[PDB]
Amino acid sequence: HMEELQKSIGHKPEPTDEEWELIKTVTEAHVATNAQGSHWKQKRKFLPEDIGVDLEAFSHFTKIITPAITRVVDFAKKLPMFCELPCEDQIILLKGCCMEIMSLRAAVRYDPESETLTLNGEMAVTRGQLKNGGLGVVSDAIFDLGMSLSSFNLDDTEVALLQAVLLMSSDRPGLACVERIEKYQDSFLLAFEHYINYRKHHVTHFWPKLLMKVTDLRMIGACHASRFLHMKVECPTELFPPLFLEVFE
Numbered sequence: 196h197m198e199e200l201q202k203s204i205g206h207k208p209e210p211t212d213e214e215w216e217l218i219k220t221v222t223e224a225h226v227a228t229n230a231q232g233s234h235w236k237q238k239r240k241f242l243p244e245d246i247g248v249d250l251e252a253f254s255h256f257t258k259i260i261t262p263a264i265t266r267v268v269d270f271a272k273k274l275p276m277f278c279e280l281p282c283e284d285q286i287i288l289l290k291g292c293c294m295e296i297m298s299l300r301a302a303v304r305y306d307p308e309s310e311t312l313t314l315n316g317e318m319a320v321t322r323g324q325l326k327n328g329g330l331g332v333v334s335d336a337i338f339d340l341g342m343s344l345s346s347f348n349l350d351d352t353e354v355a356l357l358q359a360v361l362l363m364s365s366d367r368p369g370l371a372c373v374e375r376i377e378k379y380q381d382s383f384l385l386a387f388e389h390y391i392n393y394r395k396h397h398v399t400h401f402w403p404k405l406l407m408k409v410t411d412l413r414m415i416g417a418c419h420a421s422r423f424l425h426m427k428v429e430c431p432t433e434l435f436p437p438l439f440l441e442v443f444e
């Protein structure tokens with residue numbers, strides 16, 4: 196052990212044995228629940244230029260959102276720390292992280308040849324389409340993120356660990372087990388940092404840079420809560436799948 200003194204000497208600690216297990220678990224959790232795995236660039240339908248609040252865009256995205264929400268719940272269920280928490284807390288962390296995690300899984304499928312992200316592994320959209328379909332400027336935040344993340348060269352473990360950091364956010368309103376959720380967080384952040392030392396990215400100050408993405412995903416979430424209200428007034432209610440409603444209010 197002895198984190199602060201290794202650092203202080205200039206050494207970059209790689210993962211302890213217990214951390215490599217934590218990493219194997221989050222990584223498999225993510226890889227299991229990540230639609231179409233590594234086979235996504237070919238298994239993807241480009242949404243027609245003409246689907247262009249544009250109601251038919253909205254309708255295509257709401258048709259696929261229910262599975263995408265459920266693959267996040269699945270991600271969480273495969274983290275034993277999440278199972279150690281009370282039911283109210285779990286629901287509370289899911290509702291909090293759900294847009295954050297979906298946004299991240301979209302951003303990391305950004306493709307610069309086509310300027311598209313891919314939703315659910317299956318539907319590639321432009322900025323325009325995602326924006327006009329209900330996301331507004333949340334779409335711009337998501338593409339700008341994905342563009343940026345593409346020099347971070349993240350792998351499945353780094354995305355998985357980001358998801359675990361967002362999932363274990365102890366500042367959500369109403370939580371009962373705050374300090375336990377922070378302990379699990381710190382345990383993820385510590386594994387994640389150690390994992391990045393091992394990765395030896397060729398980017399100056401990679402860690403703090405990656406932490407700044409956590410904040411941007413949080414902003415994308417908060418900002419999506421607001422878009423969702425603007426949608427309750429524009430689009431119906433009958434246009435909204437029931438899992439969508441329950442997660443977002």
Ligand SMILES: N[C@@H](Cc1cc(I)c(Oc2ccc(O)c(I)c2)c(I)c1)C(=O)O
Nearest residue numbers: 256260263297298300301313314315329
């Ligand atoms: N692509 C992700 C899942 C993912 C699915 C969908 I539909 C997305 O679009 C949204 C989300 C919220 C909204 O209110 C609207 I309107 C559209 C995003 I951004 C992400 C995955 O692989 O899990």
